[PDB]
Amino acid sequence: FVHVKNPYLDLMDEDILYHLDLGTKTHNLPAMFGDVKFVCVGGSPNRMKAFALFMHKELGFIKDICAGTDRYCMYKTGPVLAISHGMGIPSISIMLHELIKLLHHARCCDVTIIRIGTSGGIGIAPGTVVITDIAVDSFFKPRFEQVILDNIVTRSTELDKELSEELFNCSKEIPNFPTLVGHTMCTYDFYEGQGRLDGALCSFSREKKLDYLKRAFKAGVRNIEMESTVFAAMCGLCGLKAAVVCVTLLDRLDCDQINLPHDVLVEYQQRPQLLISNFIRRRLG
Amino acid sequence: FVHVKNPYLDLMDEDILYHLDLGTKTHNLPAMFGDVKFVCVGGSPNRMKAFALFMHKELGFIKDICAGTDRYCMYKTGPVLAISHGMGIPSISIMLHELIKLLHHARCCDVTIIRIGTSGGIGIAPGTVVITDIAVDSFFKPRFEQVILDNIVTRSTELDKELSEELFNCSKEIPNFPTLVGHTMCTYDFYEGQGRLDGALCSFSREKKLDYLKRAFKAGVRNIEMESTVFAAMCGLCGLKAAVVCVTLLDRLDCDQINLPHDVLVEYQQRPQLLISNFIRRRLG
Ligand SMILES: O=c1[nH]c(=O)n(COCCO)cc1Cc1ccccc1
Ligand SMILES: O=c1[nH]c(=O)n(COCCO)cc1Cc1ccccc1
C-alpha cells in the first residue's frame, strides 16, 4: 500500500487536493483510483495526454480528470495514470504531495511511479535514453536539500535499483533505441544553472561552462533536467518504487541548441513512452 | 529600453525562445511586441487570460500567442501583455529568461512588469493585498541564492521603491480594499516549506510550525508565495522596474485552510487586477 510520511494526515476529517480539483469528501477516491498500478509523470500536458492515448492503444482497450483546474492534467487508462507536472522542483513537488496522498486515500497497492521527460545529454549521442540510477544536484552530489521551515534537511536521491535494472533489460529488446543507466543532474535554472550562454543572464565564460560540463561527466552525470532529485527523494521517503526515464535531445559538450529535423525530434520525444509501454505490457503479461 | 545582462546574446545569429514557441527569425518580434508597456505575470493561465479580457474592457477597446506550446500562455491587448508562469521559482525563471529576451528583441521601452497572485497571509486579514517591498527566502533573508554552474551567487530582492509607492497610493482611493506594503516570503515547497500539516510529507509538529510563522511575522513577513525572490532578483539585474501584488486568501496564524463563500473567494482573487487596472489607466490617462 502507498504510505505518506505525515502523522497528522489521517487524523484529519477531510483532505482537499487543492491543485488537482479532488478531495476525500467530494470524491470516492478508492472507487476512482483503487486499481491504479502505473503512474507516469512528465512536464508537458500534451505529451502526457498523448501518452495516455498511446497506452490505451497499446493495451488494446479518455478525459482530463483535473479538467476543473489549470494546474495539472491527469488521464487514466486502466491501471495506468498519467499526470503532467509542469517545470521545476517546486511544481513537481506540489503535484507529488497531492498525488502520493491520492494514492494513499484511494488505497492503491503494488504501485510503480515513473517520470518520463526530455533532457540535455553529456557525452552521449542525441536521442539516448537515460534510466537514472541516482539523481544528483548542481554540485554533482547525490542528495536533495529540502527546505523545511527555516531548516535545510538532506534527503537521499537513489531510484529503485531493481526497477532501473528491469527497465534496462526491457530497453535491450528494442531496435534503434540507445539506452544507458547513469546519473542525472537536476538544476533549479534551465539557463545559467545548466551552463547555457543564451539566457537573459549569463555571468560566466565559455571556458567555465565547458569545464563545468566536463567535470559533470567525470562525476558520472549523463543527462540534465529539472525534476529528478525531488522526485527520487519524495518517492523514496514514502516508500514508492520510482524510476526516471529521459531522452536526451542534444549533447551539451558539443551543442547548446537542438539541431534536428522535426521528424527526428518527434521520434526522440517518443522514446521514453516506447520503453514504458514495453515495461507495462511485460508486468501485465 | 529593456536590457539583458548577457554579453553572448547579441553575438548570436538567431535566438529561439523554446518555451514560448517564438524566435527572432521565425517571428518579427518588434512588430508583435514593440508597443508593450505593461507586463503582467501570474501562475494560472485561466486567470491570466481572464485578466487580459478584463483589461481589454477596462481600457475600452484575444488569443494565446503561445498556442503552439503547452509550457506557458500569453495574451496581448494594446500595451498590455499577460503571461502565465506556472508554479515555483524554476518555472517562473525560464519564463523570465525568455520574456526579458523577447522584450529586448522587440525593442520595448518604458516597460513595467508586475507579478499578480494569491498568497498565504501572516497576521493580516484574509483578502489583504500585499505590495511587496522586499522579497525574502525561507530563512527570512532579503536575498535570492542563484545557482550558476556549481556556484552560489546571492542577489538583491528589492522591488522598485517608486513603483510600490505608486501602487500603494493607487489603492487608497479604492473602498473596501485592505492594502499594505511589506515583506513577502517565497518558498520552494508549498507544504513543508510553508509549515503546512497536510502534505504527503510532514517533518515538524503543529507547535513548531506555529512558532516558525510567528518568527516569520517578527522578521517582517506578511505573506507567503512561491515566485517573488527570483522575480525580484532577475528583473533587478536587468534594470527592469518590477512589482509584486498578491492578495491573501487566509491568515496562516489562524487557519491552515481557506474558509470563504464562493463569492468572497472570487472577489479576493480579483483584487490584484482591480489595483493593476487603476494603475494602468492612471499611466495612460
Ligand atoms: O537541455 C535540456 N535541459 C532540461 O532540463 N530539459 C528538461 O526540460 C526542462 C524544460 O524544457 C530538456 C533539455 C533539452 C532541451 C534543450 C534545449 C531546448 C529545449 C529542450
Ligand atoms: O498559502 C498559499 N501559499 C502560496 O504559496 N500561494 C501561492 O501559490 C501557490 C499555488 O497555489 C497561495 C496560497 C493561498 C492558498 C492556500 C491554500 C490552498 C491554496 C492556496
Coordinates of C-alpha atoms and ligand atoms in Angstrom, one line a residue:
Chain A
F1 CA 0.0 0.0 0.0
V2 CA 1.0 3.6 -0.7
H3 CA 2.1 5.4 2.5
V4 CA 2.6 9.0 3.4
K5 CA 5.2 10.3 5.9
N6 CA 2.9 12.6 7.9
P7 CA 1.4 11.6 11.3
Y8 CA -1.3 14.2 11.1
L9 CA -2.9 13.5 7.7
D10 CA -5.2 10.6 8.7
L11 CA -6.2 12.4 11.9
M12 CA -8.0 15.0 9.6
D13 CA -11.7 14.8 8.8
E14 CA -11.2 15.7 5.2
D15 CA -8.3 16.1 2.7
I16 CA -8.7 18.6 -0.2
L17 CA -6.1 18.2 -3.0
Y18 CA -6.0 21.9 -3.9
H19 CA -4.2 21.7 -7.2
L20 CA -5.9 18.5 -8.6
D21 CA -9.6 19.6 -8.1
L22 CA -10.1 16.4 -6.0
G23 CA -10.9 15.6 -2.3
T24 CA -11.8 12.8 0.1
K25 CA -15.3 14.1 0.8
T26 CA -16.3 15.3 -2.7
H27 CA -15.0 12.2 -4.5
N28 CA -14.8 8.5 -4.0
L29 CA -11.0 8.1 -4.3
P30 CA -10.8 4.3 -3.8
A31 CA -13.5 3.8 -6.5
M32 CA -11.9 6.2 -8.8
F33 CA -8.2 5.2 -8.5
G34 CA -8.1 1.9 -6.5
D35 CA -7.0 -0.2 -9.4
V36 CA -4.0 2.1 -10.4
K37 CA -0.7 0.3 -10.7
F38 CA 1.4 2.5 -13.0
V39 CA 1.8 6.2 -12.5
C40 CA 3.6 8.1 -15.3
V41 CA 4.6 11.7 -14.9
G42 CA 6.0 14.3 -17.2
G43 CA 6.2 18.1 -17.7
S44 CA 4.1 18.6 -20.8
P45 CA 0.3 18.2 -20.6
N46 CA 0.0 17.4 -24.4
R47 CA 2.7 14.7 -24.0
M48 CA 1.0 13.1 -21.1
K49 CA -2.4 13.1 -22.9
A50 CA -0.7 11.6 -26.0
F51 CA 1.0 9.1 -23.7
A52 CA -2.4 8.0 -22.2
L53 CA -4.0 7.6 -25.6
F54 CA -0.9 5.6 -26.7
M55 CA -1.2 3.3 -23.7
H56 CA -4.9 2.9 -24.4
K57 CA -4.0 1.6 -27.9
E58 CA -1.0 -0.5 -26.6
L59 CA -3.1 -2.3 -24.0
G60 CA -5.8 -3.0 -26.7
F61 CA -8.8 -1.4 -24.9
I62 CA -10.1 9.4 -22.2
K63 CA -10.7 12.7 -20.3
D64 CA -8.8 15.1 -18.1
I65 CA -9.7 14.1 -14.6
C66 CA -8.5 17.6 -13.4
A67 CA -10.5 19.5 -16.1
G68 CA -11.7 21.8 -13.3
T69 CA -8.1 23.2 -12.6
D70 CA -5.4 24.5 -14.9
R71 CA -2.5 23.4 -12.7
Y72 CA -2.0 19.8 -13.8
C73 CA -3.7 17.3 -16.2
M74 CA -4.5 13.7 -15.4
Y75 CA -5.6 10.9 -17.5
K76 CA -6.5 7.3 -16.6
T77 CA -6.5 4.2 -19.0
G78 CA -7.0 1.1 -17.0
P79 CA -4.2 0.7 -14.3
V80 CA -2.2 3.5 -15.9
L81 CA -2.5 7.0 -14.6
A82 CA -0.7 9.8 -16.5
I83 CA -0.1 13.2 -15.0
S84 CA 1.6 16.5 -16.0
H85 CA 3.8 18.3 -13.5
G86 CA 4.9 21.5 -15.2
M87 CA 8.5 22.5 -14.8
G88 CA 10.9 22.5 -11.9
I89 CA 11.4 21.2 -8.4
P90 CA 8.6 23.2 -6.8
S91 CA 6.0 22.4 -9.5
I92 CA 6.6 18.6 -9.5
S93 CA 6.7 18.6 -5.7
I94 CA 3.3 20.2 -5.3
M95 CA 2.0 17.5 -7.7
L96 CA 3.8 14.7 -5.9
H97 CA 2.4 15.7 -2.5
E98 CA -1.1 15.6 -3.8
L99 CA -0.6 12.5 -5.9
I100 CA 1.0 10.5 -3.2
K101 CA -1.9 11.4 -0.9
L102 CA -4.4 10.5 -3.6
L103 CA -2.8 7.0 -4.0
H104 CA -2.8 6.7 -0.2
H105 CA -6.5 7.7 0.1
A106 CA -7.5 5.5 -2.9
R107 CA -5.7 2.6 -1.1
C108 CA -3.6 1.8 -4.1
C109 CA -1.1 -1.1 -3.7
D110 CA 1.9 -2.5 -5.6
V111 CA 2.3 0.8 -7.5
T112 CA 5.2 1.9 -9.6
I113 CA 5.9 5.5 -10.5
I114 CA 8.0 6.7 -13.4
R115 CA 9.0 10.1 -14.6
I116 CA 9.3 10.4 -18.4
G117 CA 10.9 13.5 -19.8
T118 CA 13.5 15.2 -22.1
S119 CA 16.9 16.3 -21.0
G120 CA 20.2 17.6 -22.3
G121 CA 22.9 14.9 -22.7
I122 CA 26.6 15.0 -21.6
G123 CA 29.0 12.9 -23.7
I124 CA 26.2 10.7 -25.2
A125 CA 24.5 10.8 -28.6
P126 CA 21.4 12.9 -29.0
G127 CA 18.4 10.6 -28.5
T128 CA 20.0 8.3 -26.0
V129 CA 17.5 7.3 -23.3
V130 CA 18.9 7.6 -19.7
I131 CA 17.4 5.5 -16.9
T132 CA 18.6 7.4 -13.8
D133 CA 20.3 5.3 -11.1
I134 CA 20.9 8.2 -8.8
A135 CA 19.9 11.9 -9.2
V136 CA 22.4 14.5 -8.3
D137 CA 22.3 18.2 -7.6
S138 CA 24.1 21.1 -9.4
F139 CA 27.4 20.3 -7.4
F140 CA 27.1 16.7 -8.6
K141 CA 26.1 15.5 -5.1
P142 CA 23.6 12.5 -4.6
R143 CA 21.3 14.5 -2.4
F144 CA 18.2 16.6 -2.3
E145 CA 18.5 19.6 0.1
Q146 CA 15.0 20.1 1.3
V147 CA 14.0 23.4 3.0
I148 CA 11.6 22.6 5.8
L149 CA 10.5 25.7 7.7
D150 CA 13.9 27.6 8.1
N151 CA 16.0 24.4 8.1
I152 CA 17.9 22.5 5.4
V153 CA 17.3 18.7 5.6
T154 CA 19.3 16.5 3.2
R155 CA 17.4 13.6 1.6
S156 CA 18.8 10.6 -0.4
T157 CA 18.1 10.5 -4.2
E158 CA 18.6 6.9 -5.3
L159 CA 15.9 5.5 -7.6
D160 CA 14.7 1.9 -7.2
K161 CA 17.7 -0.3 -8.2
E162 CA 15.7 -3.4 -9.2
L163 CA 13.3 -1.3 -11.2
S164 CA 16.1 0.5 -13.1
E165 CA 17.7 -2.9 -13.9
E166 CA 14.3 -4.2 -15.2
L167 CA 13.7 -1.1 -17.4
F168 CA 17.2 -1.5 -18.8
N169 CA 16.5 -5.2 -19.6
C170 CA 13.3 -4.1 -21.4
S171 CA 15.3 -1.5 -23.4
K172 CA 17.7 -4.2 -24.8
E173 CA 14.9 -5.8 -26.9
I174 CA 14.0 -2.5 -28.7
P175 CA 15.8 -1.8 -32.1
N176 CA 17.5 1.5 -32.6
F177 CA 17.0 2.5 -29.0
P178 CA 20.2 3.7 -27.5
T179 CA 19.9 3.4 -23.7
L180 CA 22.0 3.7 -20.6
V181 CA 21.8 3.6 -16.8
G182 CA 23.6 6.7 -15.4
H183 CA 23.4 9.8 -13.1
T184 CA 21.0 12.6 -13.9
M185 CA 21.8 16.2 -12.6
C186 CA 18.8 18.2 -11.6
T187 CA 19.0 22.0 -11.7
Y188 CA 16.9 25.0 -10.5
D189 CA 17.6 27.1 -13.6
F190 CA 17.5 26.0 -17.2
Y191 CA 19.9 28.6 -18.4
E192 CA 22.8 29.6 -16.1
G193 CA 22.1 26.6 -14.0
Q194 CA 22.8 24.4 -17.0
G195 CA 25.8 26.4 -18.3
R196 CA 23.8 27.8 -21.3
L197 CA 25.1 31.0 -22.9
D198 CA 21.7 32.2 -24.3
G199 CA 19.8 33.3 -21.1
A200 CA 18.7 36.9 -20.3
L201 CA 21.6 36.4 -17.8
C202 CA 25.0 34.9 -18.3
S203 CA 27.7 35.7 -15.8
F204 CA 30.3 33.1 -16.7
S205 CA 32.8 32.4 -19.6
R206 CA 32.6 29.8 -22.3
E207 CA 35.7 28.2 -20.6
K208 CA 33.9 27.9 -17.3
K209 CA 30.8 26.4 -18.9
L210 CA 32.8 23.7 -20.8
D211 CA 34.9 23.0 -17.7
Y212 CA 31.6 22.5 -15.7
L213 CA 30.1 20.1 -18.2
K214 CA 33.3 18.0 -18.4
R215 CA 33.6 17.9 -14.5
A216 CA 29.9 16.8 -14.5
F217 CA 30.8 14.0 -16.9
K218 CA 33.8 12.9 -14.8
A219 CA 31.4 12.9 -11.8
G220 CA 29.1 10.4 -13.6
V221 CA 26.5 12.8 -15.0
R222 CA 24.9 11.7 -18.3
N223 CA 21.9 14.0 -18.6
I224 CA 20.4 17.1 -17.1
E225 CA 16.9 18.0 -16.4
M226 CA 14.9 19.8 -13.6
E227 CA 12.9 17.3 -11.5
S228 CA 14.9 14.2 -10.7
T229 CA 16.2 14.9 -7.2
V230 CA 13.0 15.9 -5.5
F231 CA 11.1 13.2 -7.4
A232 CA 13.6 10.5 -6.3
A233 CA 13.7 11.9 -2.7
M234 CA 9.9 12.2 -2.2
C235 CA 9.2 8.8 -3.6
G236 CA 11.9 7.2 -1.5
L237 CA 10.7 8.8 1.7
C238 CA 7.2 7.5 1.1
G239 CA 8.5 4.0 0.0
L240 CA 7.2 4.3 -3.6
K241 CA 9.3 2.3 -6.2
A242 CA 10.4 5.0 -8.6
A243 CA 12.2 5.5 -11.9
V244 CA 13.2 8.4 -14.2
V245 CA 13.4 7.7 -17.9
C246 CA 14.5 10.7 -20.0
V247 CA 15.6 11.1 -23.7
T248 CA 18.4 13.5 -24.5
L249 CA 17.7 16.0 -27.3
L250 CA 21.3 17.2 -27.8
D251 CA 24.8 16.6 -26.4
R252 CA 25.8 19.6 -24.3
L253 CA 29.6 19.0 -24.8
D254 CA 29.1 19.8 -28.4
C255 CA 26.0 21.8 -28.6
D256 CA 23.6 24.3 -26.9
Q257 CA 20.8 24.1 -29.5
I258 CA 18.7 21.2 -30.8
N259 CA 19.5 20.8 -34.5
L260 CA 17.1 18.2 -35.6
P261 CA 14.6 17.7 -38.4
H262 CA 11.2 18.0 -36.7
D263 CA 10.6 14.4 -37.6
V264 CA 13.6 13.1 -35.7
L265 CA 12.7 15.3 -32.7
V266 CA 9.2 13.6 -32.6
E267 CA 10.8 10.2 -32.7
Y268 CA 13.2 11.1 -29.8
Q269 CA 10.4 12.6 -27.7
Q270 CA 8.5 9.3 -28.1
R271 CA 11.4 7.1 -26.9
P272 CA 10.7 7.1 -23.2
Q273 CA 6.9 6.1 -23.8
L274 CA 8.1 3.3 -26.0
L275 CA 10.2 1.9 -23.2
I276 CA 7.4 2.4 -20.6
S277 CA 4.8 0.6 -22.8
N278 CA 7.2 -2.4 -23.1
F279 CA 7.7 -2.4 -19.3
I280 CA 4.0 -2.2 -18.5
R281 CA 2.9 -4.9 -21.0
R282 CA 5.7 -7.1 -19.5
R283 CA 4.3 -6.5 -16.0
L284 CA 0.7 -7.2 -17.1
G285 CA 1.8 -10.0 -19.5
Chain B
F1 CA 14.9 50.1 -23.4
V2 CA 14.6 46.6 -21.9
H3 CA 18.2 45.2 -21.4
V4 CA 19.6 41.8 -21.0
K5 CA 22.7 41.1 -19.0
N6 CA 24.4 38.6 -21.3
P7 CA 27.5 39.5 -23.5
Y8 CA 26.9 36.4 -25.7
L9 CA 23.4 37.1 -26.6
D10 CA 23.6 39.6 -29.4
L11 CA 26.6 37.9 -31.0
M12 CA 24.1 35.2 -31.9
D13 CA 22.7 34.7 -35.4
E14 CA 19.2 33.8 -34.1
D15 CA 17.6 33.3 -30.7
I16 CA 14.9 30.7 -30.1
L17 CA 12.5 31.2 -27.2
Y18 CA 11.9 27.5 -26.8
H19 CA 9.2 27.5 -24.1
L20 CA 7.3 30.4 -25.7
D21 CA 7.2 29.0 -29.3
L22 CA 8.7 32.2 -30.6
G23 CA 12.1 33.2 -32.2
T24 CA 13.9 36.1 -33.8
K25 CA 13.9 34.6 -37.2
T26 CA 10.5 32.8 -37.3
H27 CA 8.9 35.9 -35.8
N28 CA 9.1 39.6 -36.2
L29 CA 9.3 40.5 -32.5
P30 CA 9.3 44.3 -32.8
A31 CA 6.1 44.1 -35.0
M32 CA 4.4 41.8 -32.5
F33 CA 5.5 43.3 -29.2
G34 CA 7.1 46.7 -29.7
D35 CA 4.2 48.6 -28.2
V36 CA 4.0 46.6 -25.0
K37 CA 4.3 48.9 -21.9
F38 CA 2.8 46.8 -19.1
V39 CA 3.7 43.2 -18.5
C40 CA 1.5 41.3 -16.1
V41 CA 2.6 37.8 -14.9
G42 CA 0.7 35.2 -12.8
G43 CA 0.7 31.4 -12.1
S44 CA -2.6 30.5 -13.7
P45 CA -3.3 30.5 -17.5
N46 CA -7.1 30.8 -16.8
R47 CA -6.6 33.7 -14.6
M48 CA -4.1 35.5 -16.9
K49 CA -6.5 35.0 -19.8
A50 CA -9.4 36.5 -17.8
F51 CA -7.1 39.4 -16.7
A52 CA -6.3 40.1 -20.4
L53 CA -10.1 40.1 -21.1
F54 CA -10.7 42.4 -18.1
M55 CA -8.1 44.9 -19.2
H56 CA -9.4 44.9 -22.8
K57 CA -12.8 46.0 -21.4
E58 CA -11.1 48.4 -18.8
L59 CA -9.2 50.2 -21.4
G60 CA -12.3 50.4 -23.5
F61 CA -11.2 48.6 -26.7
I62 CA -7.6 37.9 -27.7
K63 CA -5.9 34.6 -28.4
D64 CA -3.0 32.6 -26.9
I65 CA 0.1 33.9 -28.7
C66 CA 1.8 30.7 -27.4
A67 CA -0.9 28.3 -28.7
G68 CA 2.0 26.2 -30.2
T69 CA 3.3 25.2 -26.8
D70 CA 1.9 24.0 -23.5
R71 CA 4.5 25.5 -21.2
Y72 CA 3.1 29.0 -20.8
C73 CA 0.2 31.1 -22.2
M74 CA 0.4 34.7 -23.3
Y75 CA -2.3 37.2 -24.3
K76 CA -2.0 40.8 -25.6
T77 CA -4.4 43.7 -25.6
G78 CA -2.9 47.0 -26.6
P79 CA 0.2 47.9 -24.5
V80 CA -0.7 45.1 -22.1
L81 CA 0.8 41.7 -22.2
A82 CA -0.4 39.0 -19.8
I83 CA 1.7 35.8 -19.3
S84 CA 1.3 32.7 -17.1
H85 CA 4.3 31.3 -15.4
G86 CA 3.2 28.1 -13.7
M87 CA 4.3 27.4 -10.1
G88 CA 7.6 28.0 -8.4
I89 CA 11.0 29.5 -8.8
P90 CA 12.3 27.4 -11.8
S91 CA 9.0 27.6 -13.7
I92 CA 8.9 31.5 -13.5
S93 CA 12.7 31.8 -14.1
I94 CA 12.5 30.1 -17.5
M95 CA 9.5 32.3 -18.5
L96 CA 11.5 35.3 -17.3
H97 CA 14.7 34.5 -19.2
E98 CA 12.7 34.1 -22.3
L99 CA 10.3 37.1 -21.6
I100 CA 13.1 39.5 -20.9
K101 CA 14.9 38.5 -24.1
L102 CA 11.7 38.9 -26.1
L103 CA 11.3 42.5 -24.7
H104 CA 14.9 43.2 -25.6
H105 CA 14.4 41.8 -29.2
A106 CA 11.1 43.7 -29.6
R107 CA 12.9 46.9 -28.6
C108 CA 10.3 47.6 -25.9
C109 CA 10.8 50.8 -23.9
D110 CA 9.3 52.3 -20.7
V111 CA 8.1 48.9 -19.5
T112 CA 6.7 48.0 -16.1
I113 CA 6.5 44.4 -15.0
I114 CA 4.1 43.2 -12.3
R115 CA 3.5 39.8 -10.7
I116 CA -0.1 39.4 -9.6
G117 CA -1.1 36.4 -7.5
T118 CA -2.6 34.8 -4.3
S119 CA -0.7 34.1 -1.1
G120 CA -1.0 32.9 2.4
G121 CA -1.2 35.9 4.9
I122 CA 0.6 36.1 8.2
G123 CA -1.0 38.2 10.9
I124 CA -3.1 40.2 8.4
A125 CA -6.9 39.7 7.5
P126 CA -7.8 37.4 4.6
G127 CA -8.3 39.5 1.4
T128 CA -5.4 41.8 2.3
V129 CA -3.4 42.9 -0.7
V130 CA 0.3 43.0 -0.2
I131 CA 2.5 45.1 -2.3
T132 CA 6.0 43.6 -1.7
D133 CA 8.9 45.9 -0.8
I134 CA 11.5 43.2 -0.3
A135 CA 11.2 39.5 -1.1
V136 CA 12.8 37.1 1.4
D137 CA 13.6 33.4 1.5
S138 CA 12.5 30.7 3.9
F139 CA 15.0 31.9 6.5
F140 CA 13.6 35.4 6.2
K141 CA 16.7 36.8 4.5
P142 CA 16.5 39.5 1.8
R143 CA 18.4 37.6 -0.9
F144 CA 17.9 35.2 -3.8
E145 CA 20.5 32.4 -3.9
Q146 CA 21.3 31.9 -7.6
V147 CA 22.8 28.5 -8.6
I148 CA 25.1 29.2 -11.5
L149 CA 27.1 26.1 -12.7
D150 CA 28.2 24.8 -9.3
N151 CA 28.5 28.1 -7.5
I152 CA 26.0 30.0 -5.3
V153 CA 25.6 33.8 -6.0
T154 CA 23.4 35.9 -3.8
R155 CA 21.3 38.6 -5.5
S156 CA 19.2 41.6 -4.1
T157 CA 15.5 41.1 -3.9
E158 CA 14.3 44.7 -3.6
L159 CA 11.3 45.6 -5.7
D160 CA 11.1 49.1 -7.3
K161 CA 10.6 51.6 -4.5
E162 CA 8.8 54.2 -6.5
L163 CA 6.5 51.7 -8.3
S164 CA 5.5 50.2 -4.9
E165 CA 4.7 53.7 -3.5
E166 CA 2.7 54.5 -6.7
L167 CA 0.8 51.2 -6.4
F168 CA 0.1 51.9 -2.7
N169 CA -1.1 55.5 -3.5
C170 CA -3.5 54.0 -6.1
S171 CA -5.0 51.6 -3.5
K172 CA -6.0 54.4 -1.2
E173 CA -8.9 55.5 -3.5
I174 CA -10.4 52.1 -3.5
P175 CA -13.2 51.3 -1.0
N176 CA -13.0 48.0 1.0
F177 CA -9.6 47.2 -0.3
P178 CA -7.2 46.5 2.5
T179 CA -3.6 47.0 1.3
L180 CA -0.1 47.1 2.8
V181 CA 3.5 47.4 1.6
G182 CA 5.6 44.6 3.3
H183 CA 7.9 41.6 3.1
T184 CA 6.9 38.6 1.1
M185 CA 8.5 35.2 1.8
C186 CA 9.0 32.9 -1.2
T187 CA 9.4 29.2 -0.6
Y188 CA 10.5 26.2 -2.8
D189 CA 7.8 24.0 -1.3
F190 CA 4.1 24.6 -0.9
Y191 CA 3.7 22.2 2.0
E192 CA 6.7 21.7 4.3
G193 CA 8.2 24.9 3.1
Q194 CA 5.1 26.8 4.2
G195 CA 4.5 25.0 7.6
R196 CA 1.5 23.0 6.3
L197 CA 0.5 19.9 8.1
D198 CA -1.4 18.3 5.3
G199 CA 1.4 17.3 2.8
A200 CA 2.4 13.7 1.8
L201 CA 5.4 14.6 4.0
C202 CA 5.4 16.5 7.3
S203 CA 8.6 16.6 9.2
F204 CA 7.6 19.0 12.1
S205 CA 4.9 19.3 14.7
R206 CA 2.0 21.8 14.8
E207 CA 3.8 23.6 17.6
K208 CA 7.0 24.0 15.6
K209 CA 5.0 25.3 12.5
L210 CA 3.2 27.9 14.6
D211 CA 6.5 29.1 16.1
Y212 CA 8.0 29.4 12.6
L213 CA 5.1 31.5 11.4
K214 CA 5.3 33.8 14.4
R215 CA 9.1 34.2 13.9
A216 CA 8.3 34.9 10.2
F217 CA 5.9 37.7 11.3
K218 CA 8.6 39.1 13.7
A219 CA 11.0 39.2 10.8
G220 CA 8.6 41.4 8.8
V221 CA 7.0 38.7 6.7
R222 CA 3.3 39.5 5.8
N223 CA 2.5 36.9 3.2
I224 CA 3.9 33.8 1.6
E225 CA 4.1 32.7 -2.1
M226 CA 6.5 30.9 -4.4
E227 CA 7.9 33.2 -7.1
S228 CA 8.9 36.6 -5.6
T229 CA 12.6 36.3 -4.8
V230 CA 13.7 35.1 -8.3
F231 CA 11.2 37.5 -10.0
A232 CA 12.7 40.5 -8.0
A233 CA 16.3 39.4 -8.4
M234 CA 16.1 38.8 -12.2
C235 CA 14.1 41.9 -13.0
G236 CA 16.5 44.0 -10.9
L237 CA 19.6 42.6 -12.6
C238 CA 18.2 43.5 -15.9
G239 CA 17.2 47.0 -14.5
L240 CA 13.5 46.3 -15.1
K241 CA 11.0 48.2 -12.9
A242 CA 9.1 45.4 -11.1
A243 CA 6.4 44.9 -8.5
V244 CA 4.6 42.0 -6.8
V245 CA 1.0 42.4 -5.9
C246 CA -0.7 39.4 -4.1
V247 CA -4.0 39.0 -2.3
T248 CA -4.0 36.8 0.9
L249 CA -6.7 34.0 1.0
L250 CA -6.2 33.1 4.6
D251 CA -4.3 34.1 7.8
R252 CA -1.8 31.3 8.5
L253 CA -1.6 32.3 12.2
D254 CA -5.3 31.5 12.5
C255 CA -6.1 28.7 10.0
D256 CA -4.4 26.3 7.7
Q257 CA -7.4 26.2 5.3
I258 CA -9.3 28.7 3.1
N259 CA -12.8 29.2 4.6
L260 CA -14.7 31.5 2.3
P261 CA -18.1 31.8 0.4
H262 CA -17.5 31.3 -3.3
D263 CA -18.4 34.9 -4.0
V264 CA -15.9 36.2 -1.4
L265 CA -13.1 34.0 -2.9
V266 CA -13.8 35.3 -6.4
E267 CA -13.7 39.0 -5.1
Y268 CA -10.4 38.4 -3.2
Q269 CA -8.9 36.7 -6.3
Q270 CA -9.8 39.7 -8.5
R271 CA -8.3 42.3 -6.1
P272 CA -4.9 42.4 -7.5
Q273 CA -6.2 43.0 -11.1
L274 CA -8.5 45.7 -9.8
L275 CA -5.5 47.6 -8.4
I276 CA -3.5 47.0 -11.6
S277 CA -6.3 48.3 -13.8
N278 CA -6.4 51.5 -11.7
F279 CA -2.6 51.8 -12.0
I280 CA -2.6 51.2 -15.8
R281 CA -5.4 53.6 -16.6
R282 CA -3.7 56.2 -14.5
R283 CA -0.5 55.8 -16.5
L284 CA -2.4 56.0 -19.8
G285 CA -4.6 58.8 -18.5
Ligands
LIG1 O1 18.7 20.8 -22.1 C1 17.7 20.4 -21.5 N1 17.6 20.7 -20.2 C2 16.4 20.3 -19.5 O2 16.3 20.5 -18.3 N2 15.4 19.7 -20.1 C3 14.3 19.3 -19.4 O3 13.1 20.2 -19.5 C4 13.3 21.4 -19.0 C5 12.2 22.2 -19.7 O4 12.3 22.0 -21.2 C6 15.5 19.5 -21.5 C7 16.6 19.8 -22.2 C8 16.6 19.6 -23.7 C9 16.3 20.9 -24.4 C10 17.4 21.7 -24.8 C11 17.1 23.0 -25.4 C12 15.8 23.4 -25.6 C13 14.8 22.6 -25.1 C14 15.0 21.4 -24.5
LIG2 O1 -1.0 29.7 1.1 C1 -0.6 29.9 -0.1 N1 0.8 29.8 -0.4 C2 1.2 30.1 -1.6 O2 2.4 30.0 -1.9 N2 0.3 30.5 -2.6 C3 0.8 30.8 -3.9 O3 0.5 29.9 -5.0 C4 0.8 28.6 -4.7 C5 -0.1 27.8 -5.7 O4 -1.4 27.7 -5.2 C6 -1.1 30.7 -2.3 C7 -1.5 30.4 -1.0 C8 -3.0 30.5 -0.8 C9 -3.6 29.1 -0.8 C10 -3.8 28.5 0.4 C11 -4.4 27.2 0.5 C12 -4.6 26.5 -0.7 C13 -4.4 27.1 -1.9 C14 -3.9 28.4 -2.0

